[PDB]
Amino acid sequence: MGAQVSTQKTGAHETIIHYTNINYYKDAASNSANRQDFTQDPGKFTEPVKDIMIKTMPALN
Amino acid sequence: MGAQVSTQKTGAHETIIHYTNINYYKDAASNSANRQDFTQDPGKFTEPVKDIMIKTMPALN
Amino acid sequence: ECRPGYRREPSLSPKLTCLQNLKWSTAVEFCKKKSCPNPGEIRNGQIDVPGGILFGATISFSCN
Amino acid sequence: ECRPGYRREPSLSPKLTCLQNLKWSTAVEFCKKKSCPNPGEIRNGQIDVPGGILFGATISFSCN
Amino acid sequence: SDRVRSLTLGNSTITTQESANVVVGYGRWPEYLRDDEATAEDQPTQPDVATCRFYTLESVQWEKNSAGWWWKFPEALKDMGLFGQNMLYHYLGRAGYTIHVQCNASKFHQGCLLVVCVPEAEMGCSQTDKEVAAMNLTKGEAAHKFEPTKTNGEHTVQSIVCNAGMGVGVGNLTIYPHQWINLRTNNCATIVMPYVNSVPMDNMFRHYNFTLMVIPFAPLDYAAQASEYVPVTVTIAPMCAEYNGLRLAYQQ
Amino acid sequence: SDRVRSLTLGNSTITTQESANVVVGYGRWPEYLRDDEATAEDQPTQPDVATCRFYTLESVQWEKNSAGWWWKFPEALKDMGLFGQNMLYHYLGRAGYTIHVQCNASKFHQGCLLVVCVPEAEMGCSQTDKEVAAMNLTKGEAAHKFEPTKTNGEHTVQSIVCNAGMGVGVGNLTIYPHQWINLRTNNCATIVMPYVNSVPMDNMFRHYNFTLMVIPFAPLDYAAQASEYVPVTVTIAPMCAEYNGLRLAYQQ
Amino acid sequence: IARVADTVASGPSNSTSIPALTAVETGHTSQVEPSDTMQTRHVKNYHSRSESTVENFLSRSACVYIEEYYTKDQDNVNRYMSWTINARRMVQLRRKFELFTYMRFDMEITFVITSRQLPGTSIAQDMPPLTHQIMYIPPGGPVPNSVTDFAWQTSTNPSIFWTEGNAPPRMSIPFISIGNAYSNFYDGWSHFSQNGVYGYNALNNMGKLYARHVNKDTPYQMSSTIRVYFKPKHIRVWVPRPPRLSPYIKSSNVNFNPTNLTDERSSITYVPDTIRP
Amino acid sequence: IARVADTVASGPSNSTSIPALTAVETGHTSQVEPSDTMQTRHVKNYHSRSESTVENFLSRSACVYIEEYYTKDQDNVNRYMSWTINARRMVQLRRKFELFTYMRFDMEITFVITSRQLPGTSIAQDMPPLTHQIMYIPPGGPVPNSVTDFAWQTSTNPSIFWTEGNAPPRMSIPFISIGNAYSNFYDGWSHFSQNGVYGYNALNNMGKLYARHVNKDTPYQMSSTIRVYFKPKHIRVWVPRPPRLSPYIKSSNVNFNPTNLTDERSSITYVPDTIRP
Numbered sequence A, B: 001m002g003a004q005v006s007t008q009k010t011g012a013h014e015t016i017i018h019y020t021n022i023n024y025y026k027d028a029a030s031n032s033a034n035r036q037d038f039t040q041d042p043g044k045f046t047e048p049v050k051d052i053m054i055k056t057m058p059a060l061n
Numbered sequence C, D: 001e002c003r004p005g006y007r008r009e010p011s012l013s014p015k016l017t018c019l020q021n022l023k024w025s026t027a028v029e030f031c032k033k034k035s036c037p038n039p040g041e042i043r044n045g046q047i048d049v050p051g052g053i054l055f056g057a058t059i060s061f062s063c064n
Numbered sequence E, F: 001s002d003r004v005r006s007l008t009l010g011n012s013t014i015t016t017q018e019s020a021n022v023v024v025g026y027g028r029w030p031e032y033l034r035d036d037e038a039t040a041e042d043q044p045t046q047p048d049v050a051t052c053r054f055y056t057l058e059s060v061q062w063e064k065n066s067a068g069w070w071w072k073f074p075e076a077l078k079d080m081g082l083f084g085q086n087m088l089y090h091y092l093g094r095a096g097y098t099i100h101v102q103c104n105a106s107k108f109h110q111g112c113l114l115v116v117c118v119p120e121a122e123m124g125c126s127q128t129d130k131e132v133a134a135m136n137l138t139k140g141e142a143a144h145k146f147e148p149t150k151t152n153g154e155h156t157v158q159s160i161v162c163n164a165g166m167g168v169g170v171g172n173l174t175i176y177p178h179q180w181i182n183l184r185t186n187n188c189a190t191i192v193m194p195y196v197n198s199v200p201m202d203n204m205f206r207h208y209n210f211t212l213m214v215i216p217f218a219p220l221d222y223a224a225q226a227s228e229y230v231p232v233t234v235t236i237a238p239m240c241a242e243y244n245g246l247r248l249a250y251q252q
Numbered sequence G, H: 001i002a003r004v005a006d007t008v009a010s011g012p013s014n015s016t017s018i019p020a021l022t023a024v025e026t027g028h029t030s031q032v033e034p035s036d037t038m039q040t041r042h043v044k045n046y047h048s049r050s051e052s053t054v055e056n057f058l059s060r061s062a063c064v065y066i067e068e069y070y071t072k073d074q075d076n077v078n079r080y081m082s083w084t085i086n087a088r089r090m091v092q093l094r095r096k097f098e099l100f101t102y103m104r105f106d107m108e109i110t111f112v113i114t115s116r117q118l119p120g121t122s123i124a125q126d127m128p129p130l131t132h133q134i135m136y137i138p139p140g141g142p143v144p145n146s147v148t149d150f151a152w153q154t155s156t157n158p159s160i161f162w163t164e165g166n167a168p169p170r171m172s173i174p175f176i177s178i179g180n181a182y183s184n185f186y187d188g189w190s191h192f193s194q195n196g197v198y199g200y201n202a203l204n205n206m207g208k209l210y211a212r213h214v215n216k217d218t219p220y221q222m223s224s225t226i227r228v229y230f231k232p233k234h235i236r237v238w239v240p241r242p243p244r245l246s247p248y249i250k251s252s253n254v255n256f257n258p259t260n261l262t263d264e265r266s267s268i269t270y271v272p273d274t275i276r277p
């Protein structure tokens, strides 16, 4: 089938950890949640300044 | 799929003995128990001595 | 001056200052509780120390 | 028990044992001299501290 | 001759001419915390020779009717040189420890002690309806002793030996790092305990990582005119001592 | 902008937005004792971050009639965290120190202090016929102050400023590691002192390696309604602290 | 993958570097870390922000509504359910959604229907399993006025038929909004003359949902309680905002009563002494 | 794979080899076998310690709790369940876990919920299937004070809705502990002043678990009994210890009564004669 093997979340016996998935429905809205999308970009809220500010330097000068 | 064939435990008709497995869930905590991990090292408790002791020899000399 | 029975803590001032806000400065533990002698031992018995052995502390006894 | 004015040293036993030689065990400094308050300061003056400020100590004064 | 052995940690050295090998914890030897297992971000302090040395505790007397004794660490070393000073000024601590119990007699005396290190030796109360007090669990370098009979104290520990004050069988304590001191063959016992805990580090006043128990299975005995005074001294030396969270000393 | 600077030692950090560079002892920077210069055979202890951190002493008030102040180290830090604990338990010591004197006012205040580090600042007595008492030389983190006039004390130090209590000219103290705190341009002063002594190491209670003196050459002044309270705080942090000769703590 | 930043080992310092000094006036949040203001040790941090994901945060079934409807036609009891779909009547889920201004996602809807028999002196029955019918009516569709209305024919409107005992009915729905994203906040009106409806209700219109018993009638009065659950998935959120501080009063607007910024305490220097040996 | 050691064939002996002689003082357990103290024959031992595995030993559902909650609001009967999760109230499973000091593992939790109708003279009913709701509340979450509390909205707290008749509800959970391993024994306190709580309760805090009937009300009083089962999997254990000898008294500490080391008997030389022709 259109099987798609992904990686499972670390277990309590770490340091065959993968699962299989197949969509049965025609609408993408039927698929399960995307609990594995780990994107980040705090810059939008933490550093929305026009002029890049270097940590080790004075904010104003 | 991400099928993984392993060996079954001996049956009452020994002396096709393998099973198939596929994880359906995204979390490793959902997987079945690891009833086939046979590791051993009694040394920790039976021989936690600093100086190796040879059976056929005197413990003290 | 330490009350009875308390003892001075060499690392701290037994003094207080009247701040601008008419509040006395925060007091430290310049005077601590005097510790009682080690209860000792009871032959074929036990000493229960629920809350240390300093002044005001209590200890119970029992026999095996 | 500490005399006046001495204070107990938490790290040591205020107890003595009668040894086999009929000698009392060597005594430690289980009771030390209580320290006096910091002499302070004299405006346009000086405080001479020849031997610390503990009990029994003396301090002299002078003016610039 | 494996009978003789020498131990050197810091400015301290122990000698023995009648030992019985050396038990090394659970097969592991004391080691500093690795970066892939650390949690405290601040750079730890490692006094080394300053705290990692042999500290001798108050000796104890072994009598024909002695039931046993026990110490709790690192608490028992709260007033020991700089090792105790770091416990006061730091929030977190981590150490190894090399337990060395001494006890000599003569070829004419007899008895057998059980030197054991029990991790998380949670103990019970005399009165099952009440709780225990820290004062009754551990009291500095002063050892608490087991009783051959039941105890009654309000907040005292059930010192009855047969249950080791844990509600278990004393004969099964051999499952912990241990050694025996069979006077007819021994003279001391050494145990190198590695840091054992469910956390990289922990407070040293609030938590008693392990308990050292010395329980005699063979009653001390001897004939007339034979030295009746048989003391049992305990010496312990921290190993790979690390400290984190420096702040104002804790008022005991 | 070289005006702003940041200092980080251990778990302490100092900030400045009006400094004047940094004086580094006699061109040297604190360093541990080398093997080809060591004498004590025992392996030294180096608490590092435990003792090498910024210790703030009791602040002092600068008044229109203030003549000066002075501290003696390492004595002045005998009760400072673990740095003081190592002084008690060890016979020998060795450290660097980073002196940082703070003192802010306003563009409307005026005055000029002289922060200096005087090695072996042996001082004289008020009564030239008598001797001085340690109690009058240094009293913990409590600062001794210079007087604008002659002193008379029995065993007191000749606090008269003009002679700096050493029988010399105050205007020549600039020959020692120093900096000024000219309120109209400054805000603090930092001096990195390297271990200076005629011996690899030395006792820290018996010997006062150096004396920190803060003498104002420009009297503090201001107009009405202008903050009259102008404190002067001193912060110092040991560097490359080494210790030898571990033994029972010294009873002060 | 979603790992956290490690802490670089830092040593002593003495330079013109001022990472600790800054100016919030710029609207810039300091990017300082422990290693910048002290001596730190290297630490391989394996922690992960995997559960902080907007997906894992909002993707959890939460109750959004609940109504009761009876079987027999006695008194003035409603024999069917009606509901103008929205998630503003349940403070819990409503508060989460309101952490963001706009949202976009598909959704999993689950229904927990339970029945009961009203108290009585003589109520001995033997009613077969109760079958329910949930019908979704998008804006404009004909609304039923009785438990026997022709509207229940479900000719084109999505509907579910469930019998008690079986697993709670469920079904997914895409992104319905006619806009490019659902709007949790609408600082505007419905009419150009700046009047009429103000806020959410001014533009949101997900239609209505009706329920009923398909069973003709029960000997003695019985009632059922339907609980609607929402579980957004394939989530997208924009413009974060200050969480709700004041309790929710109305489900149509953001009205509130002046609430305290937080709990009180003795003084700014008050800190409970928890160390008392 | 997990096979047992075979017995090498041994013959007569007469040397300075002393495998039988040793010294327990070293704390070393003799590694002697039959072939060392007698003449043995070769034996291909096929036995396996496969069931002695810590995994196979602890990985078996064991009851850890049980409470009863009623449907009607009559008298002072609790209509919902509350429970501060822990496995110290059931001696069986508690004793196994306590064979080790520290533990690390994921866990499979199963619930066995059963209901009944309290006795009565006239209790003729016809109640539909009873639906239950089990909600987990991690430390800090809002706790419900009634069977109609807003907390049951389960906005973010994990919750299960189960109807009688179906298979007992189940679900897995990872390794929650904030530490690197669960602690069965904690010889320490909760406060730095060495006081307050002592032992397990001093640090363990898995939160609470609540249950209830989602059904509005029952004509006549009925009650349900929920039984919680734990089945650790993907197990890891450290520091083994002496099994519990004294009976368990409290579920908060290790208090006990001086118990006998074992059963008694006539004398050290007593052995029952089982051969009597």
Ligand SMILES: CCCCCCCCCCCC(=O)O
Pocket: G085, G086, G087, G097, G103, G109, G136, G158, G173, G176, G182, G183, G184, G204, G206
């Ligand atoms: C078939 C049932 C259809 C139900 C539609 C529900 C849509 C929910 C949209 C929520 C909008 C919002 O929260 O801002």
Ligand SMILES: CCCCCCCCCCCC(=O)O
Pocket: H085, H086, H087, H097, H103, H109, H136, H158, H173, H176, H182, H183, H184, H204, H206
């Ligand atoms: C969703 C239900 C969560 C239940 C958490 C149970 C955690 C059990 C931990 C047991 C700890 C121990 O036995 O030492």
